[PDB]
Amino acid sequence: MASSNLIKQLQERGLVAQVTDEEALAERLAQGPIALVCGFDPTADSLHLGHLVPLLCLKRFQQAGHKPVALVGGATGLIGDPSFKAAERKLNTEETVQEWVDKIRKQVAPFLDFDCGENSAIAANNYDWFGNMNVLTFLRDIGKHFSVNQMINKEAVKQRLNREDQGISFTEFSYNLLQGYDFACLNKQYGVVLCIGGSDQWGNITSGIDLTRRLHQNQVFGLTVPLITKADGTKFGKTEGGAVWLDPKKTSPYKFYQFWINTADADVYRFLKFFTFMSIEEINALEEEDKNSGKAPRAQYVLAEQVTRLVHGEEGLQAAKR
Amino acid sequence: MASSNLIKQLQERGLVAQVTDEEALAERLAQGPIALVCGFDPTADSLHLGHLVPLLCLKRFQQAGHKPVALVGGATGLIGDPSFKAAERKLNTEETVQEWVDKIRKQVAPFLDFDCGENSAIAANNYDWFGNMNVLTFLRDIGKHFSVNQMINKEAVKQRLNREDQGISFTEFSYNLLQGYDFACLNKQYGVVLCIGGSDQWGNITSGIDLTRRLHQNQVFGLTVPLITKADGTKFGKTEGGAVWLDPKKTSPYKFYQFWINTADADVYRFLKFFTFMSIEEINALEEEDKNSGKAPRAQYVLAEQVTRLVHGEEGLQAAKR
Numbered sequence: 001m002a003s004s005n006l007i008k009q010l011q012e013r014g015l016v017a018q019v020t021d022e023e024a025l026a027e028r029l030a031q032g033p034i035a036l037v038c039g040f041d042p043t044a045d046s047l048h049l050g051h052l053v054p055l056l057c058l059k060r061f062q063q064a065g066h067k068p069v070a071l072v073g074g075a076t077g078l079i080g081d082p083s084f085k086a087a088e089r090k091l092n093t094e095e096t097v098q099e100w101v102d103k104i105r106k107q108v109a110p111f112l113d114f115d116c117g118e119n120s121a122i123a124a125n126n127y128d129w130f131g132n133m134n135v136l137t138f139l140r141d142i143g144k145h146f147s148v149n150q151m152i153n154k155e156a157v158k159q160r161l162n163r164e165d166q167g168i169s170f171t172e173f174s175y176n177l178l179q180g181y182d183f184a185c186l187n188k189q190y191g192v193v194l195c196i197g198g199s200d201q202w203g204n205i206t207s208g209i210d211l212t213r214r215l216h217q218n219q220v221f222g223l224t225v226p227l228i229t230k231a232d233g234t235k236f237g238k239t240e241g242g243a244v245w246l247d248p249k250k251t252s253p254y255k256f257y258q259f260w261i262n263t264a265d266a267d268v269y270r271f272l273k274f275f276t277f278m279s280i281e282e283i284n285a286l287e288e289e290d291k292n293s294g295k296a297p298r299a300q301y302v303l304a305e306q307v308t309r310l311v312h313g314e315e316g317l318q319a320a321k322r
Numbered sequence: 323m324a325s326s327n328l329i330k331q332l333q334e335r336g337l338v339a340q341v342t343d344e345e346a347l348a349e350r351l352a353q354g355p356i357a358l359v360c361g362f363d364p365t366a367d368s369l370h371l372g373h374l375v376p377l378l379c380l381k382r383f384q385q386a387g388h389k390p391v392a393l394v395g396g397a398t399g400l401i402g403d404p405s406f407k408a409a410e411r412k413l414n415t416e417e418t419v420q421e422w423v424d425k426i427r428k429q430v431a432p433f434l435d436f437d438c439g440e441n442s443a444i445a446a447n448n449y450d451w452f453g454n455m456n457v458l459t460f461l462r463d464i465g466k467h468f469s470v471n472q473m474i475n476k477e478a479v480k481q482r483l484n485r486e487d488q489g490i491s492f493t494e495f496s497y498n499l500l501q502g503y504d505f506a507c508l509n510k511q512y513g514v515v516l517c518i519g520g521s522d523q524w525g526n527i528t529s530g531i532d533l534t535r536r537l538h539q540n541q542v543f544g545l546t547v548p549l550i551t552k553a554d555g556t557k558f559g560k561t562e563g564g565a566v567w568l569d570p571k572k573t574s575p576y577k578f579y580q581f582w583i584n585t586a587d588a589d590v591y592r593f594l595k596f597f598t599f600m601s602i603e604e605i606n607a608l609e610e611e612d613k614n615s616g617k618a619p620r621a622q623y624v625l626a627e628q629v630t631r632l633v634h635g636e637e638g639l640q641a642a643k644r
């Protein structure tokens with residue numbers, strides 16, 4: 001009945017929006033290292049700042065000794081996740097998505113350790129199991145476990161089905177089943193018992209938990225990180241020029257460092273908790289220090305330095321000063 | 323602008339429940355012979371009396387010079403049509419359905435002419451195009467043309483989604499898309515421009531009409547035959563022993579003839595119109611004759627003789643008397 005303090009620690013950083021059976025999860029985490037997964041869809045040839053918190057959270061779990069499975073949606077990216085989206089996602093071609101998958105897999109790799117013993121990271125691609133799956137097999141073997149009555153009640157698609165100015169394609173309506181099966185598949189092959197995801201993923205994650213129970217009779221868990229907000233109410237990671245990419249060829253390390261330096265005083269201490277590995281004690285002391293220094297706050301350049309090194313390494317940090 | 327009288331003729335037999343753009347259809351029918359389709363799902367190793375009106379209606383179209391496509395649902399029978407059904411259909415195995423498909427195809431054949439020139443019948447099986455279709459291709463290429471908002475409003479599935487004592491699987495919810503694509507596929511390969519079906523098929527047929535427009539920009543049509551009713555309110559074709567099969571090994575020709583002899587006076591003249599090729603004039607004269615004869619009505623054994631010969635031929639009619 002031992003209990004891990006990992007979920008508590010993430011909670012103090014404000015990184016847990018929702019979590020299933022927290023008490024039970026904390027006990028399972030105390031049993032020993034577990035395999036967990038976080039997934040990313042190839043919506044572009046690179047991830048951007050909107051995907052960084054979940055990615056770093058996967059790394060936070062590995063640091064605590066757990067094994068991270070970095071899933072790239074080679075199949076789901078050909079369908080489109082409608083969760084809390086106002087309109088249909090653009091449909092990209094098979095050829096282009098397969099190319100983007102490889103780019104994202106490569107971009108994700110440096111963030112995790114693939115050479116640290118049994119909790120070494122593992123890359124996954126759901127195109128492996130959906131790429132050649134026949135439609136009748138999908139509809140029968142996976143589809144019979146989903147109730148449409150329940151599906152149309154999921155909060156993630158509620159507005160699309162209720163607002164006269166919106167609608168949802170059968171294509172995107174089926175997405176929840178694909179991600180649900182992803183959890184069951186990874187549970188069966190890698191022993192994955194936890195899926196963490198973005199703030200708009202609760203329903204997709206819970207469908208995976210239920211399907212894993214229905215298919216393999218195993219209890220698994222889910223956790224979502226929060227929607228990252230800015231005090232001024234604007235969208236985090238959105239600039240006049242668009243997204244802030246993690247690919248240095250799209251958004252240079254210099255520009256990336258500039259983005260963080262510009263962080264609002266109201267957001268900077270919360271952002272240090274979400275985006276860096278500094279301890280809560282050190283961040284709290286830094287906030288107190290800035291409060292009584294009479295100098296410009298140090299928090300913005302500490303944040304810029306920390307995240308720039310995490311994303312672009314020492315080379316990018318050096319490039320940010322020339 | 324010539325107009326065919328075929329739809330009018332079927333209407334006088336009481337065989338048209340619903341029909342799309344009747345005026346336009348009648349004009350198209352006057353242009354020349356068309357290819358049309360009627361489909362049957364392998365729910366059992368034989369069809370039964372509930373499937374006979376649509377089957378004979380396909381033959382009525384061939385007699386008027388049109389070309390009948392007899393479709394057997396090798397794929398749709400692995401999914402299950404939920405239209406106006408109270409509960410999920412039983413899921414049968416791939417191996418068993420494939421066997422039943424062959425049996426039904428063989429049972430249907432004798433009802434149509436496969437050797438009468440250009441309007442010769444053609445057998446089709448939707449397993450040809452769905453059997454190996456990948457799920458992502460289905461969801462994207464067919465799925466993007468369906469609105470879930472519209473799908474949940476179809477009368478055929480309304481009760482399943484609205485009544486607390488019912489529910490529908492994603493499996494059966496997807497059926498409408500399969501049958502919809504069937505129409506588009508047959509339109510493209512065989513020039514099929516009309517689909518006729520059972521009384522519970524309006525929505526499945528209209529989805530095919532809309533998808534054929536969206537995919538191939540061709541205007542096609544649909545028609546349904548009526549739910550066959552009995553004056554006493556009980557279900558037609560239902561007996562204490564179950565269904566009345568068209569397979570003589572399941573329901574003997576003798577038993578089949580007995581079923582028709584037992585027809586209620588209130589139903590017999592309507593049944594002669596639905597189930598035989600006797601002219602309306604002859605049936606009307608027979609009703610008048612029975613009205614003023616002072617003898618037992620001749621209608622029941624005329625009906626029994628006509629339908630028994632149609633279903634089991636001269637051999638079965640002879641067997642019905644020994």
Ligand SMILES: [N-]=[N+]=Nc1cc(C[C@H](N)C(=O)O)ccc1O
Binds near residue numbers: 081
């Ligand atoms: N498991 N898991 N997580 C997944 C996560 C994603 C991406 C997720 N739908 C997102 O848009 O964040 C795709 C597939 C997955 O299986």
Ligand SMILES: [N-]=[N+]=Nc1cc(C[C@H](N)C(=O)O)ccc1O
Binds near residue numbers: 403500502
């Ligand atoms: N086209 N057409 N008609 C079809 C008709 C059926 C059978 C129909 N759903 C029924 O249950 O009567 C199956 C597939 C079809 O494509």
